[PDB]
Amino acid sequence: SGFRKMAFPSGKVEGCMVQVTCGTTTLNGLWLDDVVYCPRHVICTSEDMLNPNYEDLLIRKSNHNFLVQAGNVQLRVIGHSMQNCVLKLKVDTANPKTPKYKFVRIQPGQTFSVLACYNGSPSGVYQCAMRPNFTIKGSFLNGSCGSVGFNIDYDCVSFCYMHHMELPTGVHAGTDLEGNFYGPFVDRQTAQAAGTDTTITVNVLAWLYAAVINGDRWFLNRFTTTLNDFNLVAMKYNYEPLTQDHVDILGPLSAQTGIAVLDMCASLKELLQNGMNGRTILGSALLEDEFTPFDVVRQCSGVTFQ
Amino acid sequence: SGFRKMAFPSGKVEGCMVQVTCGTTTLNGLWLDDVVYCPRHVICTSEDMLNPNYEDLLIRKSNHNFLVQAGNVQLRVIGHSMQNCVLKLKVDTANPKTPKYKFVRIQPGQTFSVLACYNGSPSGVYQCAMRPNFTIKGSFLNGSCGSVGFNIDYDCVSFCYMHHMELPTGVHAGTDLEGNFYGPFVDRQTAQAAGTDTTITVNVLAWLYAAVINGDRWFLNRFTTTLNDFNLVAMKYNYEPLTQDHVDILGPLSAQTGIAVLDMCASLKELLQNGMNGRTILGSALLEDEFTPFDVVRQCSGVTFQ
Ligand SMILES: *[C@H](O)[C@H](C[C@@H]1CC=NC1=O)NC(=O)[C@@H]1[C@@H]2[C@H](CN1C(=O)C(Oc1ccc(Cl)cc1)Oc1ccc(Cl)cc1)C2(C)C
Ligand SMILES: *[C@H](O)[C@H](C[C@@H]1CC=NC1=O)NC(=O)[C@@H]1[C@@H]2[C@H](CN1C(=O)C(Oc1ccc(Cl)cc1)Oc1ccc(Cl)cc1)C2(C)C
Numbered sequence: 001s002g003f004r005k006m007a008f009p010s011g012k013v014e015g016c017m018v019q020v021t022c023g024t025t026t027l028n029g030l031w032l033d034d035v036v037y038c039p040r041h042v043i044c045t046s047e048d049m050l051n052p053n054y055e056d057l058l059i060r061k062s063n064h065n066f067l068v069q070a071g072n073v074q075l076r077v078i079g080h081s082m083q084n085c086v087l088k089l090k091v092d093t094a095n096p097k098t099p100k101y102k103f104v105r106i107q108p109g110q111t112f113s114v115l116a117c118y119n120g121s122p123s124g125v126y127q128c129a130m131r132p133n134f135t136i137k138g139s140f141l142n143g144s145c146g147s148v149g150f151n152i153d154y155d156c157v158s159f160c161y162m163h164h165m166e167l168p169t170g171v172h173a174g175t176d177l178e179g180n181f182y183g184p185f186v187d188r189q190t191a192q193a194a195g196t197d198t199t200i201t202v203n204v205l206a207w208l209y210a211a212v213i214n215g216d217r218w219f220l221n222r223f224t225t226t227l228n229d230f231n232l233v234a235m236k237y238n239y240e241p242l243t244q245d246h247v248d249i250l251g252p253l254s255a256q257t258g259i260a261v262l263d264m265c266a267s268l269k270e271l272l273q274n275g276m277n278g279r280t281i282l283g284s285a286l287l288e289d290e291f292t293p294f295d296v297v298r299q300c301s302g303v304t305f306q
Numbered sequence: 307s308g309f310r311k312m313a314f315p316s317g318k319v320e321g322c323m324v325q326v327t328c329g330t331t332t333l334n335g336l337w338l339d340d341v342v343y344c345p346r347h348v349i350c351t352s353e354d355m356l357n358p359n360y361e362d363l364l365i366r367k368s369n370h371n372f373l374v375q376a377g378n379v380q381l382r383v384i385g386h387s388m389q390n391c392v393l394k395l396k397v398d399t400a401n402p403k404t405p406k407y408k409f410v411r412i413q414p415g416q417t418f419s420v421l422a423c424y425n426g427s428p429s430g431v432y433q434c435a436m437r438p439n440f441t442i443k444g445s446f447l448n449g450s451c452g453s454v455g456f457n458i459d460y461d462c463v464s465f466c467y468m469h470h471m472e473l474p475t476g477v478h479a480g481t482d483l484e485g486n487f488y489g490p491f492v493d494r495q496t497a498q499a500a501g502t503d504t505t506i507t508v509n510v511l512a513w514l515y516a517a518v519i520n521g522d523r524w525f526l527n528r529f530t531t532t533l534n535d536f537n538l539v540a541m542k543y544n545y546e547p548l549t550q551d552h553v554d555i556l557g558p559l560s561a562q563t564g565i566a567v568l569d570m571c572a573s574l575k576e577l578l579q580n581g582m583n584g585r586t587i588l589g590s591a592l593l594e595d596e597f598t599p600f601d602v603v604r605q606c607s608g609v610t611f612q
Contacts, residue, residue: 001476002445006430009421011317115315121610124312125431139308141608170307214476285591302447304427
């Protein structure tokens with residue numbers, strides 16, 4: 001029993017974190033095989049980052065300009081190249097701690113674990129969702145660039161996020177490991193804003209199913225609703241539309257608890273229309289949307305990773 | 307910017323987890339140097355755990371009854387002994403991944419990270435507080451016994467918790483690594499209940515300071531209050547008393563933000579008396595109490611561990 005915002009064990013990623021220094025800038029890099037991946041704005045200076053021309057900035061660079069440190073062991077850069085918004089530093093040693101891995105790009109609505117890092121040293125781990133507006137509500141201070149987000153399936157690390165910047169609402173933006181930004185953001189210090197967000201509807205329903213599995217049932221009801229009449233209510237609470245695919249995803253949870261998906265939407269409808277009225281659900285006084293249907297089955301069933 | 311319930315990187319602990327099997331029971335053990343620590347109710351059967359006599363049960367045991375598996379490598383038990391509610395299995399190999407460590411017992415109100423484990427394989431990591439009633443609100447399924455809780459300071463792991471049981475309200479109880487229970491609980495399947503809980507007052511104030519550091523200020527006010535007049539209000543919202551020591555702990559946070567501790571108590575007083583009125587604080591609609599003043603400074607300053 002219980003339900004916690006749970007991250008993957010971070011060990012396999014901790015062994016890949018290194019410190020990358022170029023001149024005055026220091027940030028984190030990800031060392032897999034004989035390549036170190038890091039944000040390309042490491043080549044930038046303070047006066048550069050207002051409107052940089054990275055291709056120009058990089059041809060003026062040499063390998064020996066890049067100080068790569070894996071703990072207290074130096075790393076020798078033997079090549080470099082730009083891939084979109086990331087830099088790939090080829091080094092003379094392959095990381096013997098390289099796990100089985102994949103570079104995957106996730107969808108808004110999906111979750112992942114973030115290993116926050118400073119000076120190549122891991123600071124903490126936590127769970128995040130990719131917001132519908134392609135931002136993440138992280139916890140990042142200066143120096144955290146190059147920290148990565150990831151999921152683990154069995155023994156394989158699927159890297160999905162590298163941190164690049166903080167936006168003025170306190171939210172965070174970054175790239176997949178191929179260097180392509182999530183959302184309409186650029187690694188320049190120009191005026192940028194997140195874009196209006198919505199609540200991840202299928203995730204709320206998953207979390208309501210976790211609550212039922214854990215003995216919270218006060219929000220249940222005898223009512224029902226059609227998928228279209230629910231979506232009419234979702235649109236007005238700035239929830240995003242529920243699809244038949246989302247209904248299908250929620251199948252196992254519906255089967256496990258005996259509550260048809262559409263019945264749970266009737267519950268969400270009333271919760272949106274009435275609030276919670278001093279009650280809580282899974283220790284929260286808000287409708288939580290950063291748990292996927294997968295996350296719920298993971299935690300409410302006890303799957304591990306090896 | 308941002309504020310997340312953040313766990314320590316779990317790598318150093320992942321390398322210590324092993325699977326301990328005795329007859330029909332399988333649970334997790336903690337392998338440090340040449341000792342494996344695990345819950346003593348691993349020696350128990352189904353019919354045993356209603357009222358066991360562990361000393362009797364253990365003399366009927368031999369080393370070869372204990373199957374210890376470190377991944378897919380067997381471990382040879384060469385001795386065993388009971389220490390309070392934990393079992394210490396001496397094995398023929400020292401764990402070469404043994405980190406620098408300490409066995410520490412924490413206070414109610416303090417936090418720690420939990421590496422949830424099944425069959426010696428880590429499943430996930432999350433942050434917990436020790437409740438005033440000596441329970442923890444964890445996420446634990448059958449097979450999770452022997453999972454440990456811990457803090458990391460620089461390179462040293464201070465183990466503070468080993469999981470033993472779930473109570474009927476869905477909360478969890480366990481021991482320090484010397485085998486002594488937190489709270490009035492016993493590793494027997496007799497009727498037991500958690501005992502009435504309170505809210506950790508100093509932690510709420512710390513979290514209010516984190517909110518201010520992160521730009522939430524709507525709950526601030528010009529009022530003030532004496533420590534005694536606050537404690538009179540705390541007692542009636544079932545918050546526990548605030549001490550001058552707690553005021554002292556909150557000093558740096560008060561200095562960083564310019565809000566005297568007693569002024570922040572006046573804010574908490576009004577929040578208790580009025581609620582939040584549709585607003586949120588750090589993405590929560592409830593007053594959060596599982597962040598210590600240390601946790602806040604950690605996250606709002608960016609300290610790492612190596
Ligand atoms: C990398 O270590 C660092 C991590 C940031 C710093 C604090 N939290 C984080 O996640 N990233 C950066 O510094 C990037 C880097 C240049 C600018 N930048 C930003 O995150 C951010 O810079 C500011 C942050 C806060 C303030 Cl008050 C002012 C600037 O960039 C933007 C700020 C504001 C807008 Cl409207 C757009 C971008 C880059 C992007 C090369
Ligand atoms: C160890 O793997 C396991 C972990 C538990 C199981 C589910 N979540 C957990 O944290 N621990 C135990 O099984 C211990 C073990 C014997 C009993 N026990 C309990 O956690 C618990 O057992 C029950 C759980 C749920 C129900 Cl519906 C019924 C029993 O023990 C108690 C239950 C109820 C009371 Cl009032 C008191 C104890 C022990 C304690 C030797």
